Design a binder for this molecule. Structure first.
Ligand SMILES: O=C(CCCCCCNC(=O)c1cnc(N(c2ccccc2)c2ccccc2Cl)nc1)NO
Ligand SMILES: O=C(CCCCCCNC(=O)c1cnc(N(c2ccccc2)c2ccccc2Cl)nc1)NO
Ligand SMILES: O=C(CCCCCCNC(=O)c1cnc(N(c2ccccc2)c2ccccc2Cl)nc1)NO
Ligand SMILES: O=C(CCCCCCNC(=O)c1cnc(N(c2ccccc2)c2ccccc2Cl)nc1)NO
Ligand SMILES: O=C(CCCCCCNC(=O)c1cnc(N(c2ccccc2)c2ccccc2Cl)nc1)NO
Ligand SMILES: O=C(CCCCCCNC(=O)c1cnc(N(c2ccccc2)c2ccccc2Cl)nc1)NO
Ligand SMILES: O=C(CCCCCCNC(=O)c1cnc(N(c2ccccc2)c2ccccc2Cl)nc1)NO
Ligand SMILES: O=C(CCCCCCNC(=O)c1cnc(N(c2ccccc2)c2ccccc2Cl)nc1)NO
Ligand SMILES: [K+]
Ligand SMILES: [K+]
Ligand SMILES: [K+]
Ligand SMILES: [K+]
Ligand SMILES: [K+]
Ligand SMILES: [K+]
Ligand SMILES: [K+]
Ligand SMILES: [K+]
Ligand SMILES: [Zn+2]
Ligand SMILES: [Zn+2]
Ligand SMILES: [Zn+2]
Ligand SMILES: [Zn+2]
Lengths: 366, 342, 366, 342
């Protein structure tokens, strides 16, 4: 065709996750929980009211199959999710914060399936790139456990699909959610065929992983790369890490597909991090990935929603990425003049030191 | 025996979107009363209330407000939520009266709306009247005190308090805050007062990402020695909890144990230099999950009764902020050089 | 064409109304206001997740023009709405409960425009019928005043459009929101070219109108018909009123178009009425209108959202109407077995008496 | 002088969607604590608290619960919100103790969770333990009373209370409710007790749409003469406000003035026949806007202090329900024939 085609995966069901649920400890009940669907729903609704949807190609998600999940997760993980989802009131699963409503496994299948649908249509050439605004998120789900709001690891399920079904030999997952993608790291730990990169706040969540000396094992040694930035890092540190480490690592690896785990909890207003990224930072991060993807594999890249918890500001951070994909700047970030003066734009010595240490790991990528 | 606690149901009755900019309306606004209400409710369900002396607030008068604010500010406020603003400032006065008189040793005034951004001329940043400056002016003008210290550990800069006492050495104003957080263009170390007040305003603008390590170091290296140097007859703490590791309106990493130690250091120096005449007045804070435990930790520092554990203690202890970083210590040491002019 | 075409008008902006805002009276502030967008948004989202959207033809609304509004409202009403919408914080307008956010007049134009778009496509034959899930509502807006959450009178603006632009000579507006359509009654009070029918709880809102002896004036005498049912009426009274009064009145009048003002606040769970209609009642009401429309004007009818305040049950009441239009029963009402035993299904003597008095007014319709 | 008021912060700390049925999750559930919390807060900001005697609740014991409930119910409840259920029943006991002893004349226990649907065997309808039946059993077994009356004007049928005292004439159980509202299959006039209890359960199932007219007529024609006939030594009122004109869980039209008159009629007959020994225990109610004014109206009936107007008085006065309709009066007159067997 002769149309610029940027895919957008959304489904009302992604906003229907049951995020509902100690007195002895005098922990008073919360009604509006941290992972409430409002935050990501406001992002979807801004895509629509900003007019960006007029430049996007809506892509209907279809459920991932059990076989799609079993490519990267244990049968026990899947059996546990089916069991909890079948309970009359649903329940928690994996850890103390991850919850399934009754029947909620359907949304988890559809979230993974949305990442697969975007992957299929990008690899086929039907779409140049796109954004999958899926819920629930994925990157903390390991081979063995759901956790951290993540039932199934959507980006890893997409990468395995691209490998097994679409013939790809090298995939890179670049995770810029502010928390460590420990699930993705675990799944591909011993596998050089998926380069796994996580940039995150050092020791944020999980508090015990994401360190720079977690580099893979066996055939996978050197094919996991963690960038654990200090609290308070903003656009300066993030853009420097993308230009000094992530882009050069991708060029060295030559992935046939780049899957971005796109969270916005590194934003300056997110409660679940101390990072200071603005919408302008996220726009640049997205643009750097699109550019290096065009350079090394003909633009085969796509973005899949992970975390983010600011209902005020996440919609504008997500829109900035969308506008980087469409080339259409239709709406201004209304916080930019206040957030820009708050700090984070300048690269600090301690931030630069971490990134430069991470840069030394690129030599072991082949 | 006598720790005062100022609360009133009306403090929880406090009552910007733009469609052309596609800013979708928010139902639950940032300063919603739930967060401070959950603090009060934890004071009761924890049993801490059994060690506190409840203190009824009474409305501050127009003359109370006009000791520090211009008529134009008060007329703007009048031209019916002003009732709660009066009662908030009135609660700070009530606690101040009862500490100075000797009825109470110390106490906490969980008031709303907050105060430290209100300057002589303008209300701003959720603040109608400057509660702590109104209580200090009352202590000076009605109760006869010559020197008051206001120590503001809300994570934002106390620009209102700085402005009110800018040219006045009879109120030492100290603000520790995240550099450039709010307001974005104030709170720098070179803002030191003017005239007779030169040297009697002290800003500690810590970098984003600072935690217990930087905060405790700042208190032991700067704030406590500044207080010893100044010899205040009363210490009023502007106690916000928005430096907490979960607060959306800052990037700092203070834990409930950090706020406890911060309160302890103030009580300890007060006990040593002015008979323990100190009190704590609520400023900001926006984490419904975590602010109640930060506030309780300060209460427990006043009552000496540890009745409840912070459920996050193991979590945040592994997240960092507890080590003093070199960039943090350099800012603090710079500020410490300013004490020689007090 | 050879496709069954049932239109569905929705726009994200309809869920963006600012429903935000006394201490002396010790009236404690409410955070989640009565007219919060959640209720009607849950109806839109159930249209999507129930699969009903697959049988619907999405119709994009376009803004009504000032001229469309000025066909039925005073210039002062429109000037007031523009003034309030322009204020930095918006403000109340008309009465003490009707609120505009900053820029909120755009949603009011788009709500009226959605009713116009459905009217155009039904009259043209592009659609057989359809449902416009617009917000804000319309039926309390008079010639002179916005009120009762209603900025502009959407169904009257649509009827006037159909008359002035599309050539129609007779239109009927049938209003089954549980409150009296006093705005619609006022606009067409002296006009026999729009038959205005309101069925509502007697004395609910406005408390001082909706009575059976309000029948129009002048050329309009006998061309306004109020059915003020007693509190506690349910399916029995409503279906009887539709079969004994509303359907015969429409047959006598022979409208070229039937516009339904479709509220669901007569439902058994709505806080703003004491009525007991179930989803099955609303399904029958819709079906009776579709049937009489097919009999007398070739199916030229359409439904436009008015009120409703139960987030639990309004989605299932609205879906029941949607399913009556599509012919596709894809989802069960999960309350039907409990609501059905609660009363309201039986026609009571006092309910029948009111309806029969209303039936005597049909003789004056020509 | 002595009107008791039972409240505890924990009563406001009380902590169904199905995706295959496309029932979208609800965040703010029907029994959210805001509604009853707003009632408590209006008691304070209205100044009514200044005329009340605060009464601290204490936990009801297992033996308190087992006077009316089976072990299987209590074991199901145990197998940590049960703490609040204990404290709710305990608050009803505390008020009962203090009324019977003479320390207080009357009072209101604003407890949560509610109680009247809990039968001997099963918790249900938001009710864990039957608070009013636990207080009546305490009054009988511990305090020696021979006759108790429980008058339940929550809009739903008190099936739990009916079940507990079904075969017992020593507790006269009266429920006025919307016919077939909840549970949908109980509350009919032919449910009159069994055995020694035959004639000592009295249901008044009013039709949907009933308002002040039917409710006041029912109280003057049935409930008050039933109480005079029975001569209770204590009157316990199960006070719900879900018959209010704005409640989503009923179709009745009672206003705040209707609840005031209802409370007044009970206090008046109590003052005449058992020394005023009556008390009021919170049951249901779901209108955050209007329930606080309905509850305050009952408080004002106990204290005799009208400090605040109902902001809806003019609105609802024009909405009807105030006239007694023929279908309503026929139900009431039918129920009145049942008094001859008390
Ligand atoms: O974006 C992501 C997200 C990864 C997962 C991050 C985990 C987020 N934690 C929560 O939501 C959370 C965890 N505990 C709690 N309470 C809690 C904490 C400790 C013990 C018991 C409860 C809590 C609950 C109610 C009130 C107050 C509190 Cl303290 N409340 C919320 N990954 O990429
Ligand atoms: C033991 C396994 N749980 C965790 O490690 C865990 C769970 N929740 C949290 N946060 C959390 C806790 C309570 C409420 C909301 C979030 C948390 C706290 C501070 C900073 C960032 C975060 Cl996410 N942090 C860690
Ligand atoms: O603790 C303290 C606090 C002092 C005060 C700090 C300022 C707090 N700002 C807000 O609450 C605030 C400011 N704008 C906004 N929106 C906003 C931003 C830019 C333009 C227009 C509106 C906003 C509103 C609705 C939805 C989304 C957004 Cl973005 N929303 C919230 N001092 O000690
Ligand atoms: N006017 C201002 O300068 C102004 C107004 N709001 C804000 N924040 C703010 C803006 C929107 C929503 C909530 C808060 C803000 C943003 C990031 C970090 C800290 C803050 Cl307080 N920041 C400055
Ligand atoms: O569907 C429709 C809807 C027609 C319009 C129906 C009007 C609906 N009234 C409200 O929303 C409303 C009206 N007053 C009030 N408070 C109120 C009542 C009287 C005086 C002052 C305020 C109120 C506010 C907060 C807390 C408690 C209360 Cl009492 N609170 C809500 N038409 O078809
Ligand atoms: C004077 C002009 N205002 C009204 O007539 C008016 C305003 N609000 C209301 N309701 C209302 C009042 C307060 C909160 C919510 C709704 C109302 C009350 C009972 C039944 C139905 C409704 Cl709608 N009822 C009437
Ligand atoms: O005051 C009293 C009260 C006594 C108890 C009366 C019963 C109260 N029912 C509920 O709260 C209730 C019951 N089901 C439901 N959903 C429901 C209905 C049918 C099937 C499954 C769920 C529901 C849940 C979420 C969203 C939408 C819906 Cl429809 N949602 C709420 N007694 O004195
Ligand atoms: N089980 C039941 O019988 C049952 C459960 N919920 C309900 N209501 C209910 C159902 C869903 C949401 C909220 C309440 C109910 C419905 C209409 C009128 C009154 C009520 Cl209480 N009604 C019965
Ligand atoms: K790997
Ligand atoms: K990451
Ligand atoms: K000074
Ligand atoms: K400060
Ligand atoms: K007419
Ligand atoms: K109507
Ligand atoms: K009995
Ligand atoms: K009852
Ligand atoms: Zn994250
Ligand atoms: Zn602050
Ligand atoms: Zn209505
Ligand atoms: Zn009830």
């Amino acid at each position: 065709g002769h149309m610029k085609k940027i895919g957008y995966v959304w489904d009302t069901l992604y906003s229907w996750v049951d995020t509902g649920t100690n007195l002895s400890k005098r922990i008073q009940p919360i009604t509006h929980h941290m992972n409430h669907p409002d935050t990501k729903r406001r992002f979807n609704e801004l895509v629509m009211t900003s007019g960006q949807i007029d430049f996007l190609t809506p892509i209907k998600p279809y459920p991932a199959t059990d076989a799609d999940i079993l490519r990267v997760h244990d049968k026990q993980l899947l059996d546990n999710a089916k069991n909890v989802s079948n309970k009359e009131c649903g329940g928690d699963i994996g850890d103390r914060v991850t919850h399934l409503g009754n029947g909620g496994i359907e949304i988890a299948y559809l979230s993974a399936g949305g990442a697969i649908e975007l992957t299929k249509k990008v690899i086929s050439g039907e779409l140049h790139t796109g954004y999958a605004l899926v819920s629930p998120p994925g990157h903390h789900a390991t081979k063995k456990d759901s956790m951290g709001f993540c039932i199934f690891n959507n980006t890893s399920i997409a990468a395995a699909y691209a490998k097994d079904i679409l013939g790809l030999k090298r995939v890179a997952i670049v995770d810029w959610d502010v928390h460590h993608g420990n699930g993705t790291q675990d799944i591909w730990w011993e596998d050089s065929s998926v380069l796994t990169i996580s940039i995150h706040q050092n020791k944020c969540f999980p508090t015990n992983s994401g360190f720079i000396n977690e580099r893979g094992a066996g055939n996978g040694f050197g094919y996991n790369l963690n960038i654990p930035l200090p609290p308070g890092s903003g656009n300066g540190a993030y853009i420097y890490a993308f230009e000094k480490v992530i882009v050069p690592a991708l060029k060295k690896y030559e992935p046939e597909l780049i899957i971005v785990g796109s969270g916005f909890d590194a934003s300056i207003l997110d409660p679940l991090s101390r990072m200071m990224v603005s919408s302008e930072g996220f726009k640049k991060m997205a643009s750097l990935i699109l550019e290096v993807s065009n350079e090394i594999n003909g633009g085969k890249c796509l973005f899949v929603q992970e975390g983010g918890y600011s209902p005020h500001y996440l919609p504008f951070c997500g829109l900035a990425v969308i506008e980087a994909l469409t080339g259409m700047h239709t709406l201004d970030d209304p916080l930019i003049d206040m957030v820009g003066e708050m700090g984070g734009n300048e690269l600090l010595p301690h931030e630069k030191k971490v990134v430069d240490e991470c840069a030394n790991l690129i030599a072991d990528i082949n």
